Protein backbone atom coordinates (compact mmCIF):
# COMPACT_ATOMS: atom_id res chain seq x y z
CA UNK A 1 0.00 0.00 0.00
CA UNK A 2 1.22 3.49 -0.93
CA UNK A 3 2.41 5.06 2.34
CA UNK A 4 1.36 8.47 3.62
CA UNK A 5 3.47 10.95 5.56
CA UNK A 6 1.95 12.55 8.65
CA UNK A 7 3.29 14.73 11.46
CA UNK A 8 2.90 13.25 14.95
CA UNK A 9 4.73 14.12 18.19
CA UNK A 10 6.90 16.70 16.39
CA UNK A 11 8.08 14.10 13.86
CA UNK A 12 7.23 12.69 10.47
CA UNK A 13 5.65 9.25 10.60
CA UNK A 14 4.75 6.88 7.78
CA UNK A 15 1.10 5.97 8.20
CA UNK A 16 -1.94 5.43 6.00
CA UNK A 17 -5.55 6.69 5.91
CA UNK A 18 -6.89 3.50 7.48
CA UNK A 19 -4.48 3.78 10.40
CA UNK A 20 -5.32 7.26 11.67
CA UNK A 21 -7.06 7.96 14.95
CA UNK A 22 -10.12 10.15 15.41
CA UNK A 23 -8.10 13.14 16.59
CA UNK A 24 -6.38 13.23 13.19
CA UNK A 25 -8.47 15.61 11.08
CA UNK A 26 -8.62 15.70 7.27
CA UNK A 27 -11.03 18.52 6.42
CA UNK A 28 -9.92 19.29 2.86
CA UNK A 29 -8.17 17.70 -0.11
CA UNK A 30 -5.84 20.70 0.21
CA UNK A 31 -4.20 18.87 3.13
CA UNK A 32 -3.11 16.05 0.79
CA UNK A 33 0.08 16.80 -1.15
CA UNK A 34 2.62 15.03 -3.35
CA UNK A 35 6.30 16.02 -3.45
CA UNK A 36 9.19 15.06 -5.69
CA UNK A 37 12.54 14.84 -3.91
CA UNK A 38 15.79 14.69 -5.88
CA UNK A 39 18.30 11.85 -5.47
CA UNK A 40 20.84 14.69 -5.28
CA UNK A 41 19.69 15.38 -1.70
CA UNK A 42 20.61 11.84 -0.63
CA UNK A 43 24.27 12.18 -1.64
CA UNK A 44 24.39 10.27 -4.93
CA UNK A 45 27.15 11.11 -7.37
CA UNK A 46 25.87 13.61 -9.92
CA UNK A 47 28.63 13.61 -12.54
CA UNK A 48 27.52 12.46 -15.99
CA UNK A 49 29.58 9.20 -15.93
CA UNK A 50 28.14 8.13 -12.57
CA UNK A 51 24.59 9.29 -13.31
CA UNK A 52 24.23 7.55 -16.67
CA UNK A 53 25.29 4.20 -15.19
CA UNK A 54 22.05 4.28 -13.15
CA UNK A 55 19.95 4.11 -16.35
CA UNK A 56 19.45 1.21 -18.74
CA UNK A 57 17.38 0.11 -21.71
CA UNK A 58 14.65 -2.53 -21.45
CA UNK A 59 11.85 -3.85 -23.65
CA UNK A 60 8.48 -5.31 -22.71
CA UNK A 61 7.65 -2.88 -19.89
CA UNK A 62 5.08 -0.16 -20.72
CA UNK A 63 6.01 3.33 -19.51
CA UNK A 64 4.08 4.84 -16.62
CA UNK A 65 3.58 8.46 -15.52
CA UNK A 66 2.41 9.88 -12.19
CA UNK A 67 1.93 13.53 -11.29
CA UNK A 68 3.46 15.37 -8.35
CA UNK A 69 2.56 18.87 -7.20
CA UNK A 70 5.77 20.32 -5.71
CA UNK A 71 9.46 19.78 -6.38
CA UNK A 72 12.95 20.69 -5.25
CA UNK A 73 15.43 23.00 -6.98
CA UNK A 74 18.00 20.77 -8.64
CA UNK A 75 21.71 21.45 -9.00
CA UNK A 76 22.08 18.78 -11.70
CA UNK A 77 19.62 17.82 -14.42
CA UNK A 78 20.11 15.83 -17.60
CA UNK A 79 19.00 16.10 -21.22
CA UNK A 80 19.74 13.20 -23.57
CA UNK A 81 19.99 13.11 -27.39
CA UNK A 82 21.18 9.54 -28.03
CA UNK A 83 21.04 7.80 -31.41
CA UNK A 84 22.02 4.36 -32.61
CA UNK A 85 25.03 4.04 -34.94
CA UNK A 86 22.58 3.72 -37.85
CA UNK A 87 21.17 7.15 -36.92
CA UNK A 88 17.81 6.08 -35.49
CA UNK A 89 16.60 7.68 -32.27
CA UNK A 90 17.11 5.75 -29.04
CA UNK A 91 14.58 7.74 -27.01
CA UNK A 92 10.96 8.67 -27.70
CA UNK A 93 9.77 12.23 -28.12
CA UNK A 94 8.27 13.80 -25.03
CA UNK A 95 4.51 13.09 -24.85
CA UNK A 96 2.10 16.00 -25.07
CA UNK A 97 2.21 18.10 -21.92
CA UNK A 98 5.49 16.72 -20.54
CA UNK A 99 7.97 19.59 -20.14
CA UNK A 100 11.46 19.74 -18.69
CA UNK A 101 12.17 19.89 -14.98
CA UNK A 102 11.59 23.55 -14.04
CA UNK A 103 14.54 24.34 -11.72
CA UNK A 104 18.02 23.19 -12.77
CA UNK A 105 21.25 25.00 -11.92
CA UNK A 106 23.21 22.85 -14.38
CA UNK A 107 21.66 21.02 -17.33
CA UNK A 108 24.02 18.28 -18.51
CA UNK A 109 23.06 17.91 -22.17
CA UNK A 110 24.52 14.64 -23.49
CA UNK A 111 24.49 13.94 -27.23
CA UNK A 112 25.98 10.82 -28.74
CA UNK A 113 25.56 7.20 -29.75
CA UNK A 114 25.08 3.79 -28.18
CA UNK A 115 23.58 0.35 -28.81
CA UNK A 116 20.36 1.10 -26.88
CA UNK A 117 19.32 -2.55 -26.57
CA UNK A 118 15.79 -1.84 -25.39
CA UNK A 119 12.62 0.08 -26.24
CA UNK A 120 12.78 2.43 -23.24
CA UNK A 121 15.42 3.69 -20.81
CA UNK A 122 14.57 2.99 -17.16
CA UNK A 123 16.19 3.81 -13.83
CA UNK A 124 18.16 0.79 -12.64
CA UNK A 125 17.47 1.60 -8.97
CA UNK A 126 13.72 2.06 -9.45
CA UNK A 127 13.75 5.84 -9.10
CA UNK A 128 11.75 8.19 -11.33
CA UNK A 129 12.76 10.71 -13.96
CA UNK A 130 11.20 13.94 -12.80
CA UNK A 131 9.84 16.33 -15.36
CA UNK A 132 7.54 19.35 -14.93
CA UNK A 133 5.24 18.02 -12.20
CA UNK A 134 5.08 14.64 -13.96
CA UNK A 135 7.24 11.69 -12.91
CA UNK A 136 7.98 9.02 -15.51
CA UNK A 137 9.58 5.60 -15.36
CA UNK A 138 11.40 6.30 -18.65
CA UNK A 139 13.61 8.96 -20.24
CA UNK A 140 12.22 11.14 -23.02
CA UNK A 141 14.38 12.54 -25.82
CA UNK A 142 15.82 16.03 -25.40
CA UNK A 143 13.76 16.64 -22.26
CA UNK A 144 15.41 17.93 -19.10
CA UNK A 145 14.86 15.73 -16.05
CA UNK A 146 16.10 15.23 -12.51
CA UNK A 147 16.37 11.82 -10.87
CA UNK A 148 14.08 11.60 -7.89
CA UNK A 149 11.32 9.94 -5.91
CA UNK A 150 7.80 10.90 -4.84
CA UNK A 151 6.26 11.18 -1.38
CA UNK A 152 2.64 11.71 -0.34
CA UNK A 153 1.69 13.77 2.70
CA UNK A 154 -1.18 14.77 4.96
CA UNK A 155 -0.52 18.30 6.14
CA UNK A 156 -2.03 19.70 9.35
CA UNK A 157 -4.97 22.07 9.14
CA UNK A 158 -2.82 25.00 10.28
CA UNK A 159 16.92 34.55 -8.76
CA UNK A 160 16.94 31.54 -11.09
CA UNK A 161 20.06 30.92 -13.19
CA UNK A 162 20.53 27.86 -15.40
CA UNK A 163 23.62 26.79 -17.36
CA UNK A 164 23.74 24.13 -20.06
CA UNK A 165 26.83 21.91 -20.10
CA UNK A 166 27.22 19.96 -23.34
CA UNK A 167 28.79 16.51 -23.74
CA UNK A 168 29.51 14.07 -26.55
CA UNK A 169 29.23 10.35 -25.83
CA UNK A 170 30.10 7.08 -27.53
CA UNK A 171 29.05 3.61 -26.43
CA UNK A 172 26.26 5.10 -24.33
CA UNK A 173 24.61 2.64 -21.96
CA UNK A 174 27.43 0.08 -22.02
CA UNK A 175 30.31 -0.38 -19.60
CA UNK A 176 32.66 1.03 -22.28
CA UNK A 177 31.23 4.57 -22.47
CA UNK A 178 33.43 7.53 -23.42
CA UNK A 179 32.46 11.11 -22.59
CA UNK A 180 33.84 14.42 -23.86
CA UNK A 181 33.04 17.87 -22.48
CA UNK A 182 32.31 20.29 -25.31
CA UNK A 183 34.16 23.62 -25.28
CA UNK A 184 33.17 24.47 -28.84
CA UNK A 185 32.20 22.36 -31.86
CA UNK A 186 35.88 21.43 -32.38
CA UNK A 187 37.45 21.68 -28.89
CA UNK A 188 36.78 19.01 -26.27
CA UNK A 189 38.06 17.79 -22.91
CA UNK A 190 38.21 14.13 -21.92
CA UNK A 191 35.61 13.80 -19.17
CA UNK A 192 36.31 12.15 -15.82
CA UNK A 193 33.92 11.45 -12.97
CA UNK A 194 35.75 13.80 -10.60
CA UNK A 195 35.04 16.91 -12.71
CA UNK A 196 32.46 19.10 -10.96
CA UNK A 197 30.20 21.50 -12.90
CA UNK A 198 32.06 24.60 -11.72
CA UNK A 199 35.41 23.06 -12.68
CA UNK A 200 34.08 22.41 -16.18
CA UNK A 201 32.82 25.99 -16.49
CA UNK A 202 36.11 27.48 -15.28
CA UNK A 203 38.12 25.07 -17.44
CA UNK A 204 35.88 26.26 -20.29
CA UNK A 205 36.51 29.93 -19.51
CA UNK A 206 40.24 29.29 -19.15
CA UNK A 207 40.39 27.60 -22.56
CA UNK A 208 38.56 30.52 -24.18
CA UNK A 209 40.53 33.31 -22.47
CA UNK A 210 43.89 31.54 -22.79
CA UNK A 211 43.17 30.97 -26.48
CA UNK A 212 43.51 27.18 -26.24
CA UNK A 213 40.68 26.40 -28.66
CA UNK A 214 41.29 24.66 -31.96
CA UNK A 215 42.50 26.98 -34.74
CA UNK A 216 42.15 24.22 -37.33
CA UNK A 217 39.35 22.56 -39.26
CA UNK A 218 40.10 19.47 -37.15
CA UNK A 219 39.02 18.22 -33.74
CA UNK A 220 41.10 19.07 -30.65
CA UNK A 221 40.72 16.95 -27.51
CA UNK A 222 42.40 18.09 -24.30
CA UNK A 223 43.21 15.76 -21.42
CA UNK A 224 43.47 17.02 -17.85
CA UNK A 225 46.26 15.02 -16.26
CA UNK A 226 45.78 13.41 -12.80
CA UNK A 227 47.87 16.22 -11.29
CA UNK A 228 45.06 18.74 -11.01
CA UNK A 229 42.35 18.75 -8.35
CA UNK A 230 38.61 19.26 -8.78
CA UNK A 231 36.60 17.93 -5.84
CA UNK A 232 31.58 16.73 -0.62
CA UNK A 233 27.95 17.52 -1.40
CA UNK A 234 26.96 20.67 -3.27
CA UNK A 235 25.00 22.22 -0.38
CA UNK A 236 27.75 22.10 2.27
CA UNK A 237 30.81 23.51 0.45
CA UNK A 238 41.72 28.41 -11.71
CA UNK A 239 43.96 31.13 -13.15
CA UNK A 240 46.82 29.89 -15.37
CA UNK A 241 47.84 26.39 -16.47
CA UNK A 242 50.07 24.75 -19.09
CA UNK A 243 48.80 23.53 -22.48
CA UNK A 244 50.82 21.51 -25.00
CA UNK A 245 49.65 19.40 -27.95
CA UNK A 246 50.60 15.75 -28.37
CA UNK A 247 41.95 13.73 -34.22
CA UNK A 248 44.56 15.79 -32.35
CA UNK A 249 45.16 14.85 -28.71
CA UNK A 250 46.76 17.09 -26.10
CA UNK A 251 47.40 17.48 -22.38
CA UNK A 252 46.81 20.17 -19.76
CA UNK A 253 48.85 20.58 -16.57
Amino acid sequence: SIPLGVIHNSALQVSDVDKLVCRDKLSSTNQLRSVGLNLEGNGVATDVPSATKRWGFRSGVPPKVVNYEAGEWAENCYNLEIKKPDGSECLPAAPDGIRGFPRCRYVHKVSGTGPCAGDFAFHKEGAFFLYDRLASTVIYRGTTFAEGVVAFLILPQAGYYSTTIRYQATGFGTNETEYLFEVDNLTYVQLESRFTPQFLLQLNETIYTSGKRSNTTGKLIWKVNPEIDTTWAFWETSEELSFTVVXXXXXXX
Binding site: L32, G41, N42, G71, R103, T137, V150
Partner: protein
Protein backbone atom coordinates in the same frame (compact mmCIF):
# COMPACT_ATOMS: atom_id res chain seq x y z
CA UNK B 1 5.85 3.79 12.31
CA UNK B 2 8.49 6.51 12.40
CA UNK B 3 10.95 7.38 9.63
CA UNK B 4 14.63 6.48 9.95
CA UNK B 5 16.71 8.25 7.32
CA UNK B 6 19.27 5.68 6.13
CA UNK B 7 20.70 7.63 3.18
CA UNK B 8 24.41 8.37 2.65
CA UNK B 9 23.70 12.09 3.08
CA UNK B 10 20.81 14.46 3.77
CA UNK B 11 20.38 17.97 2.45
CA UNK B 12 18.60 19.41 5.51
CA UNK B 13 17.11 22.37 3.60
CA UNK B 14 14.34 22.06 1.00
CA UNK B 15 14.50 24.77 -1.66
CA UNK B 16 11.14 24.01 -3.25
CA UNK B 17 9.11 25.10 -6.25
CA UNK B 18 5.37 24.70 -6.77
CA UNK B 19 2.32 26.39 -8.30
CA UNK B 20 -0.93 27.83 -6.87
CA UNK B 21 -4.49 26.86 -7.75
CA UNK B 22 -5.44 30.45 -6.89
CA UNK B 23 -3.36 33.57 -6.30
CA UNK B 24 -5.22 36.87 -6.46
CA UNK B 25 -4.22 37.76 -10.01
CA UNK B 26 -3.11 41.32 -10.70
CA UNK B 27 -5.44 42.83 -13.30
CA UNK B 28 -5.50 40.69 -16.44
CA UNK B 29 -2.75 38.25 -15.42
CA UNK B 30 -5.23 35.40 -14.91
CA UNK B 31 -6.13 35.47 -18.63
CA UNK B 32 -4.05 32.83 -20.48
CA UNK B 33 -3.46 35.20 -23.41
CA UNK B 34 -1.91 37.80 -21.09
CA UNK B 35 -0.57 35.64 -18.28
CA UNK B 36 2.83 34.05 -17.65
CA UNK B 37 4.33 31.40 -19.87
CA UNK B 38 4.90 27.86 -18.67
CA UNK B 39 8.26 28.88 -17.19
CA UNK B 40 6.76 31.67 -15.08
CA UNK B 41 3.95 30.00 -13.12
CA UNK B 42 6.09 28.81 -10.21
CA UNK B 43 6.54 30.09 -6.68
CA UNK B 44 9.58 29.27 -4.56
CA UNK B 45 10.25 28.78 -0.87
CA UNK B 46 12.84 27.51 1.58
CA UNK B 47 12.05 25.01 4.35
CA UNK B 48 14.51 24.03 7.07
CA UNK B 49 14.90 20.78 9.01
CA UNK B 50 12.84 21.67 12.09
CA UNK B 51 11.57 18.50 13.80
CA UNK B 52 13.72 16.64 11.27
CA UNK B 53 10.93 16.82 8.72
CA UNK B 54 13.13 17.40 5.66
CA UNK B 55 15.48 14.47 6.27
CA UNK B 56 12.44 12.37 7.16
CA UNK B 57 10.68 13.46 3.97
CA UNK B 58 13.65 12.38 1.84
CA UNK B 59 13.55 8.94 3.46
CA UNK B 60 9.76 8.78 3.10
CA UNK B 61 9.95 9.44 -0.65
CA UNK B 62 12.66 6.78 -0.91
CA UNK B 63 10.58 4.18 0.92
CA UNK B 64 7.41 5.10 -0.99
CA UNK B 65 8.97 4.06 -4.30
CA UNK B 66 8.38 0.30 -4.17
CA UNK B 67 4.66 0.56 -3.41
CA UNK B 68 4.28 3.37 -5.95
CA UNK B 69 6.11 1.44 -8.68
CA UNK B 70 4.03 -1.68 -8.02
CA UNK B 71 0.85 0.40 -8.18
CA UNK B 72 1.96 1.89 -11.51
CA UNK B 73 2.78 -1.60 -12.83
CA UNK B 74 -0.78 -2.75 -12.16
CA UNK B 75 -2.67 0.25 -13.57
CA UNK B 76 -3.58 0.70 -17.23
CA UNK B 77 -3.83 4.49 -16.91
CA UNK B 78 -1.03 6.14 -18.86
CA UNK B 79 -0.92 9.10 -16.44
CA UNK B 80 -2.12 8.71 -12.84
CA UNK B 81 -3.67 11.76 -11.15
CA UNK B 82 -6.08 10.07 -8.72
CA UNK B 83 -3.85 8.74 -5.91
CA UNK B 84 -4.58 11.51 -3.40
CA UNK B 85 -8.30 11.69 -4.21
CA UNK B 86 -8.60 7.93 -3.67
CA UNK B 87 -6.86 8.21 -0.30
CA UNK B 88 -9.31 10.96 0.67
CA UNK B 89 -12.13 8.55 -0.20
CA UNK B 90 -10.50 5.72 1.76
CA UNK B 91 -10.19 8.11 4.72
CA UNK B 92 -13.95 8.63 4.78
CA UNK B 93 -14.76 4.96 4.12
CA UNK B 94 -12.55 3.86 7.02
CA UNK B 95 -14.37 6.15 9.47
CA UNK B 96 -17.88 6.30 7.98
CA UNK B 97 -18.17 3.23 5.72
CA UNK B 98 -20.15 1.33 8.34
CA UNK B 99 -22.41 1.94 11.32
CA UNK B 100 -20.84 4.35 13.83
CA UNK B 101 -21.19 2.77 17.28
CA UNK B 102 -20.99 5.73 19.67
CA UNK B 103 -18.25 5.46 22.33
CA UNK B 104 -16.65 2.68 20.26
CA UNK B 105 -13.01 2.98 19.19
CA UNK B 106 -13.70 3.23 15.43
CA UNK B 107 -16.48 5.84 15.72
CA UNK B 108 -15.39 9.49 15.60
CA UNK B 109 -18.46 10.92 17.34
CA UNK B 110 -17.92 12.87 20.56
CA UNK B 111 -20.99 13.13 22.81
CA UNK B 112 -19.03 15.17 25.36
CA UNK B 113 -20.83 18.54 25.55
CA UNK B 114 -24.19 16.77 25.47
CA UNK B 115 -23.39 14.10 27.98
CA UNK B 116 -23.37 17.36 29.97
CA UNK B 117 -26.68 18.45 28.40
CA UNK B 118 -28.74 15.59 29.85
CA UNK B 119 -26.95 15.11 33.19
CA UNK B 120 -27.24 18.86 33.76
CA UNK B 121 -30.94 18.97 32.84
CA UNK B 122 -31.82 15.95 34.95
CA UNK B 123 -31.92 18.73 37.55
CA UNK B 124 -35.16 19.88 35.95
CA UNK B 125 -37.10 16.75 37.04
CA UNK B 126 -35.30 15.41 40.11
CA UNK B 127 -34.93 19.11 40.91
CA UNK B 128 -38.69 19.73 40.79
CA UNK B 129 -40.16 16.71 42.54
CA UNK B 130 -42.46 18.88 44.66
CA UNK B 131 -46.24 19.02 44.99
Amino acid sequence: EAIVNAQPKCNPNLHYWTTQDEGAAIGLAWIPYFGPAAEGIYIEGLMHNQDGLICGLRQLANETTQALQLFLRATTELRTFSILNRKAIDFLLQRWGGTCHILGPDCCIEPADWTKNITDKIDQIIHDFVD
